[PDB]
Symmetry: C4
Subunit: 330 residues, 4 copies
């Protein structure tokens, strides 16, 4: 289980860095709710279906992925291990999972993309529409296959663990893509007009924002409260997911994140209608604990857990898993 | 109470064997939910009815049973006591309760059936349609009166207690019926075509699978998440039971299992519409603690608890108990 | 508060007697649910109403009572104090609260009634229709003003505290009215035909049993699960009360019991539609702790708490309190 | 966070005074429910809106306030610090927040009003309609801009912490406005006829009392259970707020109080429809801990938390925050 890795990472990382990773904003209400919400979801499995060729593969944004999952954008991964983003990206490539390269990556995006695999690029909107679009163009020129535009960070949430810790970036970690302003719908349009890559808006929670994202020409959204790190009291994405999937009615891919910690959790998200999930903190636990081989082992365990869960639920494909029904417990 | 027995069994059994017995898959969410779900159910008892002739008997699959209960299939019972299945089967016979002989029994099915009583036989689908049907034919020739086809095990769930324990069958426990593949609806048909015994599909949770089971010629189903040992996050059977009973509308017997630990719990399952229940772990606690006489004492306590509960609720018969209403609490 | 008294009684009483008093049947699910259910109820108070003449009085079964409350039937009160029922009955009389004399009283019913006040008499149905009716006639001849026919005890619930304790009546406590069989609707009719007193059926939880009680000529019912001492898993009366009040639509008085521990709890029961409440265990705590003066002090504290709660909620009368709305919390 | 201040105040204040401040009535059910209720509310934030000019200002009762918040009436503030109400009022003025001067203030209302800022005056109805109206006239002559008529205190709730503590006002704290009777709707009319200031009824929880308040010519209400200090078991205001806002349909300002402990909580109240909130206990923690500068720091932290929350939720104005949707969690 992914629970094994969390303790291993707690042991190795400096306390303040473990807190930067684990923490949420405010009283951590949304952080805790991400888990509570998943725990309340029960799947109604189907029996006696053909499982001779169970596959966890999906096609997303033009490409085959080995699982309905990608590595979430997590800034400054050298905080957790000296190889940082390169270790994660290599493991992701080898697992057939898309890796999201961050605007605030601690290794340059061009170096990360050179690893190969299916890199996506996460955008934070800069000060200058021109620099933002340069970053997009860099990503595209480097072979990234989607732009994950983070839209829930007009500014950063108040992380009281960091404030209490007086936590700051070590001098040996930098924003390697560099030598910020709130995004609007106009910024989305500027991005969409300047790339042929799918634009994916990350941090959508309202139904009318999901519909507007489709109208705006997004190729996907990530239904997300940013891992409980942005508005404290924001609803978990998993609680809005079903309503959002019904509202877009196939008009874009609908991803979800927040608290996904097992293959069963992936199955739950799928059954609620998600195209795929992102996974954040667990990938960093595996990185901290054992570098590249740590993340590879995590991804292999997830792969096995997702296949197991699907077959136990009577699903030979992710599409079938999306047609599962659920029941909320207490 | 059945709680007495659990500690007695914890004291006598080797830790790893107690864990094989107690554990569920994954994070044990479905294991815990089986109990939570029962605990939330309240019965609305009726008063002032004639109780001069209260009976707990039912007719099921051709035969009278003393209680609306059978012993669930539990593999490898010599793990818990040296007399294993023979001790349980004798106690069951003497109590007038059906005993389910397992495909993976640690005493041969013919020896268990020779004990007498009302044996049923649980089938796991083998590799070879021909060997599966041989096992069915053996059971029928031995006098088993129903085939309990387990349909929730295309493969085994990941039991993290066993994995952590590195638990494996002792060399002194074997699958005595021997000298596996996923089941499908085609396998059900092959069984149904080859026996005149009622075929009971164990591990149904979806309403449309219950209806299809009727259409397929099943004589019953067991609404079950396999004691929380198969898909972690599968809904408890008790949560689907009422919906399933309404959907089959008398077309087959509808049994339930998972967490039944008292006569009051039997009453709750009955009031939700179950024809009968299966009981698993408590029977093995009694076996571990005191062998045959242990299981006899358990069954006598259950019998007394079921009669007590029925009469306190104004029910002179199990049919009347099925007409009780319930209310969900928090 | 009534919480003060509970510890005082725990200190003075022998453990096994405190357990006889405190305990419920089975796993004590219904015992705990009585409290949970009250705790979930919130009152919506009204403001700015005339409170110049707030009164807690009600008319019930022909007579004025000082509060919408009576002392519940509790058998064998000499278990708790040497003066037993006489101490409780005197305090009740002095407080203007009806006292329920038990069939299993440890002082004869005629002695208790001689105390004066507003005694009611609780009936358990005997073996012999003739002896049952004699007991009723005795009660009526002694000046009791209602027959509280307990209808939830075809036999006694399994009290595992008592069983574990091997608890039995001390030799110095006897059933003083003596020198039992399940009740039916026919028994109710026999009682109703033989007395002009109001017949009150205690232990009704199903709506159709409440309606039938009206049809049967009951002058009241007590919506009750017998303090969690009868069917373990029976719904709390407070959860059925609103539905029952709507169903009888003024055809009899509807009382409730189970867990009433404050004037606020009385207000909650009133707001849900109860005519009055019974209070059991707290009266015995006060008796154990301080005899007659103990029960008087309890009743004075309740009186003050009920007036306080009513006025804070804008109710000058109990009728107004019945028109309060409520909201369920979590 | 406001949690920092609570411990600081616990350290400095005498135990019995900390209890006078913290406590509620009865079993403190309503006190705890105020927090529970807020914790169950999740906001659905909006993204990608223009936040170039985020403002937390509102217009209320004729005047601009810097935040959608006022300092609640809290009697006898010299209990917490020697400068008492003057320290709080100065900080409030400097923060641009209305300060509610109490009828039971420990510094005279004219001295508090001389501080300047936006003082409101809270009225308790006196014995004598003439003295009540004198107090109103004093407040108006001193420059108070609204009368906050407390309508939930026909008398004081039973504060068991105070009773247990034998707590009484120190001899060095007095009701400085002096040298009481239950309010009715007639008292509201007498106030409304005698002032041109907006009359705000504090302690409304029933929908029909909110509508009647509008009909009566109130310029606002405060939906409130008096911080859990009046009826124990009264619903939290936050649970009635949405229903009340829909019922008045713009006919008066609708404020709420009870448990507001962060800017996120203000956002939640706004999203449920509140015009503004009151904050009580936290202001007294800050006063106790650090006098005037303590309250100033609290108000600055709240201001920053409210702006943060609004912008993270896509709201450039409080009006926009009122149009946010919410979802209840568990
Ligand atoms: C340490 C940390 C840094 C993050 N950095 C970013 C970021 O730069 N961009 C972004 O869009 N999301 C960022 N996220 C949020 C994740 O992409 C994701 O939404 C969240 O972590 C998912 O929740 P999970 O960690 O519970 O799986 C970060 C998350 C964490 C924990
Ligand atoms: C140790 C163990 C072994 C089991 N073996 C089998 C099996 O061979 N076949 C099967 O259909 N169910 C099997 N089950 C599941 C039970 O038949 C039953 O569904 C479950 O135990 C009921 O839950 P309960 O144990 O809470 O009463 C097993 C259960 C346990 C605990
Ligand atoms: C020790 C004990 C003895 C009781 N004896 C009787 C009885 O003889 N007849 C009866 O109708 N109810 C009996 N009751 C139940 C009470 O009348 C009442 O329904 C229950 O105690 C109410 O719950 P409360 O104790 O929570 O207030 C008894 C209750 C207790 C605790
Ligand atoms: C110590 C104390 C004294 C109070 N005095 C008054 C008062 O004189 N008048 C009034 O209307 N409310 C009074 N209140 C209630 C507050 O105005 C407010 O409704 C409540 O404190 C809001 O809850 P909060 O403290 O959780 O923020 C008092 C509250 C406390 C804690
Ligand atoms: O997006 C986040 O929660 C992580 C982050 C951390 C530090 C600086 C920018 C972003
Ligand atoms: O069916 C089960 O949960 C029990 C089982 C244990 C070991 C091997 C097969 C089946
Ligand atoms: O009615 C009850 O719960 C109390 C009781 C105790 C002992 C004998 C008869 C009745
Ligand atoms: O209104 C309140 O809860 C506080 C109060 C305390 C003491 C006296 C009057 C009012």
């Amino acid at each position: 289980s992914l629970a094994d890795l969390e303790r291993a990472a707690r042991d190795v990382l400096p306390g303040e860095i473990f807190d930067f990773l684990a923490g949420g904003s405010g009283t951590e209400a949304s952080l805790v709710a991400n888990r509570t919400a998943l725990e309340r979801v029960f799947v109604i499995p189907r029996m006696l279906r053909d499982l001779t060729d169970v596959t966890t593969e999906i096609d997303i944004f033009g490409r085959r992925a080995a699982l309905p999952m990608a590595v979430a954008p997590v800034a400054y991964q050298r905080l957790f291990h000296p190889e940082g983003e390169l270790a994660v990206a290599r493991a992701a490539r080898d697992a057939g999972v898309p890796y999201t390269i961050c605007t605030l990556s601690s290794v340059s995006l061009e170096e990360i993309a050179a690893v190969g695999g299916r890199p996506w690029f996460q955008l934070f909107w800069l000060r200058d529409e021109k620099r933002s679009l340069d970053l997009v163009r860099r990503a595209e020129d480097a072979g990234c296959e989607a732009i994950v535009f983070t839209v829930d960070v007009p500014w950063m949430g108040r992380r009281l663990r960091d404030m209490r810790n007086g936590f700051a970036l070590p001098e040996w970690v930098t924003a390697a893509n560099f030598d910020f302003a709130p995004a609007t719908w106009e910024s989305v349009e500027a991005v969409r007009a300047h790339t042929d890559l799918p634009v994916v808006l990350k941090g959508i929670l309202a139904v009318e924002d999901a519909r507007r994202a489709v109208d705006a020409g997004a190729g996907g959204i990530v239904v997300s409260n940013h891992g409980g790190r942005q508005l404290d009291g924001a609803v978990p994405g998993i609680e809005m997911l079903g309503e959002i999937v019904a509202a877009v009615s196939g008009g874009c891919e609908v991803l979800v994140d927040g608290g996904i910690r097992s293959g069963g959790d992936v199955l739950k998200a799928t059954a609620l209608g998600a195209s795929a999930v992102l996974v954040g903190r667990p990938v960093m636990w595996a990185l901290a604990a054992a570098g590249q081989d740590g993340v590879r082992q995590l991804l292999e365990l997830l792969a096995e857990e997702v296949r197991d869960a699907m077959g136990l639920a009577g699903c030979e494909s992710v599409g079938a898993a999306r047609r599962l029904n659920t029941k909320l417990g207490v």
